[PDB]
Amino acid sequence: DAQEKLELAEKKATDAEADVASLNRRIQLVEEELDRAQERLATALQKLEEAEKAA
Amino acid sequence: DEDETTALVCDNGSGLVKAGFAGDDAPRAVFPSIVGRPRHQGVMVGMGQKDSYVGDEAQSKRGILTLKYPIEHGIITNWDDMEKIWHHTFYNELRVAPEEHPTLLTEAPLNPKANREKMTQIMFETFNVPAMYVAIQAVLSLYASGRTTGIVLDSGDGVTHNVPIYEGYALPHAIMRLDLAGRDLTDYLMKILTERGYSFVTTAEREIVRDIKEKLCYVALDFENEMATAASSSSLEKSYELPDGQVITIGNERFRCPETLFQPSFIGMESAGIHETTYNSIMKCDIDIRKDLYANNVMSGGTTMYPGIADRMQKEITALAPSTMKIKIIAPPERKYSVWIGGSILASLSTFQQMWITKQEYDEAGPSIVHRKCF
Amino acid sequence: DEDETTALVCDNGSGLVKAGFAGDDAPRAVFPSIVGRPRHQGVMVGMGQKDSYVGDEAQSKRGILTLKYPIEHGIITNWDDMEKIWHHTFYNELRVAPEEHPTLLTEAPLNPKANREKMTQIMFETFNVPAMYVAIQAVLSLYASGRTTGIVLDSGDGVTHNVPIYEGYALPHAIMRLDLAGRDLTDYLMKILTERGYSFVTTAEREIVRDIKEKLCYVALDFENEMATAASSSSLEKSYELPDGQVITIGNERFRCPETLFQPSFIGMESAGIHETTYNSIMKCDIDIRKDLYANNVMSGGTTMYPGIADRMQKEITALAPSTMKIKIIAPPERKYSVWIGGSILASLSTFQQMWITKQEYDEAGPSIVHRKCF
Amino acid sequence: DEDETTALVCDNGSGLVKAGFAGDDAPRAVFPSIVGRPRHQGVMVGMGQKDSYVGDEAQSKRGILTLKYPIEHGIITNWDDMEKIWHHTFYNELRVAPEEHPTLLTEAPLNPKANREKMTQIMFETFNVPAMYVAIQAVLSLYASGRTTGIVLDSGDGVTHNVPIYEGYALPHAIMRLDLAGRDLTDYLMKILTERGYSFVTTAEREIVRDIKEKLCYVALDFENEMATAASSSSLEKSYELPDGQVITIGNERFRCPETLFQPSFIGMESAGIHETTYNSIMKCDIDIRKDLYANNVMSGGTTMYPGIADRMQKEITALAPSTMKIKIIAPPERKYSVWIGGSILASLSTFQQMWITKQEYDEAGPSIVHRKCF
Ligand SMILES: Nc1ncnc2c1ncn2[C@@H]1O[C@H](COP(=O)(O)OP(=O)(O)O)[C@@H](O)[C@H]1O
Ligand SMILES: Nc1ncnc2c1ncn2[C@@H]1O[C@H](COP(=O)(O)OP(=O)(O)O)[C@@H](O)[C@H]1O
Numbered sequence A: 001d002a003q004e005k006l007e008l009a010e011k012k013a014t015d016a017e018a019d020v021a022s023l024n025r026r027i028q029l030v031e032e033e034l035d036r037a038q039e040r041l042a043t044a045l046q047k048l049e050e051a052e053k054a055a
Numbered sequence B, C, D: 001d002e003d004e005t006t007a008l009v010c011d012n013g014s015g016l017v018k019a020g021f022a023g024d025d026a027p028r029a030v031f032p033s034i035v036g037r038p039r040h041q042g043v044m045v046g047m048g049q050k051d052s053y054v055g056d057e058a059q060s061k062r063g064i065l066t067l068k069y070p071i072e073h074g075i076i077t078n079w080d081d082m083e084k085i086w087h088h089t090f091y092n093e094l095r096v097a098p099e100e101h102p103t104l105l106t107e108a109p110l111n112p113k114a115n116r117e118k119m120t121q122i123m124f125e126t127f128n129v130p131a132m133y134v135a136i137q138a139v140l141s142l143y144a145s146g147r148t149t150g151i152v153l154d155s156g157d158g159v160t161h162n163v164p165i166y167e168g169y170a171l172p173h174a175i176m177r178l179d180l181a182g183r184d185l186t187d188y189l190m191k192i193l194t195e196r197g198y199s200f201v202t203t204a205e206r207e208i209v210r211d212i213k214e215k216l217c218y219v220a221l222d223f224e225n226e227m228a229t230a231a232s233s234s235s236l237e238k239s240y241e242l243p244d245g246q247v248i249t250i251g252n253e254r255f256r257c258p259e260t261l262f263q264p265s266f267i268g269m270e271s272a273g274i275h276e277t278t279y280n281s282i283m284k285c286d287i288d289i290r291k292d293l294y295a296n297n298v299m300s301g302g303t304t305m306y307p308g309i310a311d312r313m314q315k316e317i318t319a320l321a322p323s324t325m326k327i328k329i330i331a332p333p334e335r336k337y338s339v340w341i342g343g344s345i346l347a348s349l350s351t352f353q354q355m356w357i358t359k360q361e362y363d364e365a366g367p368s369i370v371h372r373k374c375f
């Protein structure tokens, strides 16, 4: 029972790990997009400042 | 994987290589001109690995590689590495063999002649291309930008050429070439980042510095005033993420690097900068040419993407130029990619379909033919 | 007993030796790496009594024997005792004469050369092995763990070498060897148990303590808090049965023993512990390597079976490591055996059959051949 | 003790501290850049014992101390420890309180800027020195050496700057900073002495290896010939007496340590060595300035005391140079102390008196004054 609970808890952890791992992949991909969007934004904003200077 | 035997176009320089099919509006393969080699002894068995890594492989596995470029200030000195870069770019990424297509390669007008002699030879002898044409980069810039007339200031990775063209003709006596380039700007930045406490001495580190420059640096319209502020306040610093999770913040170094293009003395070069060479090329052209060249200062190549550069160039040139005269900067979105775009435009012209050296004219004459047929 | 002339694998360290055949999952037999010798004349009838004992006989009869290990802090100096240990494991449990099978032995890259050379000499001259191969324990651990990249912290019985590998390549400038190992943790425990009223001095007392350590001790994720309670209450003590029926209990001293891996000053060592060496091997590598090694701290050797050791190693490194990048401990239930398993994996690779020193090469070159072919 | 308010001169590197007064031709005393601290719990009462020891005190009582270096790769990171080293140097050996005398400190130009600001700041704010001057280390070797032209290769304990100087001018675009220095050579020796069966890891042991290197190692004019014999015969081994009466002998490892200066891959560095950087410093200078630098490869600092180092540097550069010119190594007796000696020369020049930062100027401007007044 400790072993079944262990395999199960290991799976609670493995599944929780699969889920956090899925989430870690999502944070890495989304946060990378956050930063790319933020960088694209910084770019758009820097371009905006120049576009406004151009305006 | 294309269904037509169009000419292939490939702007392969000292930095990056851009390639695609003639007639399109963008390169399809954009890779570094790099062949990487391990600087470590393999320890584990059955690890795969390469003898050498090419293009994106070279940067992807760079943590243990020394990375070399085959092209030095515009000239190929290592054509074995070029064959691998071209093979990868053409066969693996563009999905085409030159064997079934004419190919267009590019070079500055005063690029040493051996450069054209080898680009022609490798495509005819190792890739069996049916035809070849080495193009002038300034020509391609003018086609890409919608011009026949202007000064092409090509700010390259290894060299700045600077050539005036009027009505499609070169004015070669007015070429003002400088040993001032994007690669020197990178070297300058790492020395000043060392001053800040962040030393970069290995290839992986060199690559980081080039990445910092490309994402964080700018010129703005007035350097000395921008530096007076950046040197006085933290509000001008920008953070960059280093590969190991650590960060570097960069202050006035953010612009001192790009500024070398206007102040070459920053890297020990005996030059007045890119705006003065643009001006001198106009100045040495005939008086009835000058007005059209002042109205058309044409950007080509990279570094043209620094915030404030199109405007910095117009400002610095109008400051040297005479009054009454109109000084304009041509700084199209086809920046850094304008040589490739021009290659596509030139290759697709009906007036250019008789210009490639055939695999017959080449076989009879040898590679010296490039100077009889291309430029 | 064995169907094929596969390589034999013998991870013979300063504590235990793991012997079996390549291609399998586990050693066929595990013996202490010892030869025992009596310091007493037997009195009773039916007590055996040998001039010398090997392996499990030496441990079983240890009450009147001094037990010597052939290995001092990672190297075999007692080549006569390693011949008995090898003969016993090979012929009595594996049921093999090495003459008919290749043999794989282990060490680390900064381990003194005498070890790989004497091991090679004995297997070829005493056992007539047809081939030999001395492997790196870090290499074997990464194969067992499903890695090509990572830090292998071989927390052995007499030494920790700590060897970083990236993409299958050695990074030798970053190897950080420590005179910190499981045998020292046992010695700490003997001294602290003496303070508790249970003195241990002789070999048979240094072993029982070794058993106490393996069953009662743990690392403790948080030392100070665990100690504040363990040093204050019997509810944190565990009981051990001594050979004469006496009972010893251990409180905060239970963790004090393994704590030496995190606080080597406990045994008079000028070191901050196994996580400092792990941290530095990663830090001494290039920045495009660092992030992959942080995410792959790989366990090898024993002491890894400590309730809290993996929990603590990941905590200790993430606390030192840069943010953003992942820090991970790779601590599979294949602890203490990750090298043997790796031995089997390497020995059985088809590409590894080109790595062997053959008997003919040995007879021509002598034992120095191991340095031409291994690593 | 001192009859004039001359400048005090001190070279505080990652290795040694050289100190004397301006006007002499040698430092009066040499101390290691070390602050030592007990790593043991005192047992006897009334034993005195300092909280910290400095310089020679730190080495003399090192048996129970851990010894730390406040300077890394040329930069002071621990100013508190340097204040203690400086106080000892100034008050106990030079017998001068800085308040009554100017002080000259020095650094290589690519040393992160924080170092020159702190050297200036500590001397003005904790010692109240009436004046300060942070000098260029490369320059000081040239003054001591009798030259205004040459490549100054200041390979020290933690880093090499390597700067070409012509007619008293720097050529800053041709500086080759490299992470190769005497401290790495020591680390390389510790790894290869471990291979021989002599592991050195603790402070006492690390200091022994630095002493072994300094007395037993050599470069070897011909690396291949020396390892072929040294690795094959005891006739090329040299004995060193260890502090406890035991001995160590070293064979080809004797030259493999300094070999790293020519072979940086031994310590994990992506470099071709000190002669490649010397060559490149020359090559990146103007055509009319490379014919004077070839004839003047100038040594600076230590790691230059090797039995063959000057012999090999001349050979390696002449082998790279396009003949024609003389290639010469300038390797004066003022070795390892040419930087200190130059400091004496510079501090005392009549043409340098206006270069001193006075305390009043410092107090008005703050620590940044070093960039307005020194270099
Ligand atoms: N954001 C940027 N900042 C600075 N330089 C840039 C930037 N974008 C592009 N460049 C430069 O573009 C160069 C490569 O483009 P390119 O001029 O087309 O090579 P080539 O003309 O010789 O074939 C590189 O030196 C790169 O640093
Ligand atoms: N539960 C445990 N608690 C404490 N230490 C352990 C435990 N299991 C294994 N070790 C230690 O690790 C060593 C055995 O594993 P191993 O390292 O593979 O043998 P070797 O060091 O000879 O290669 C012994 O010193 C043993 O005490």
Ligand SMILES: Nc1ncnc2c1ncn2[C@@H]1O[C@H](COP(=O)(O)OP(=O)(O)O)[C@@H](O)[C@H]1O
Binding pocket: D011, D012, D013, D014, D015, D016, D137, D154, D155, D156, D157, D158, D182, D183, D213, D214, D215, D300, D301, D302, D303, D304, D305, D306, D336, D337, D339
């Ligand atoms: N005989 C020698 N053998 C090896 N190295 C030496 C010898 N003599 C001096 N050095 C090295 O010189 C270094 C310190 O010299 P120094 O150049 O004055 O430091 P710095 O100029 O950077 O302030 C030390 O690492 C020392 O080991």
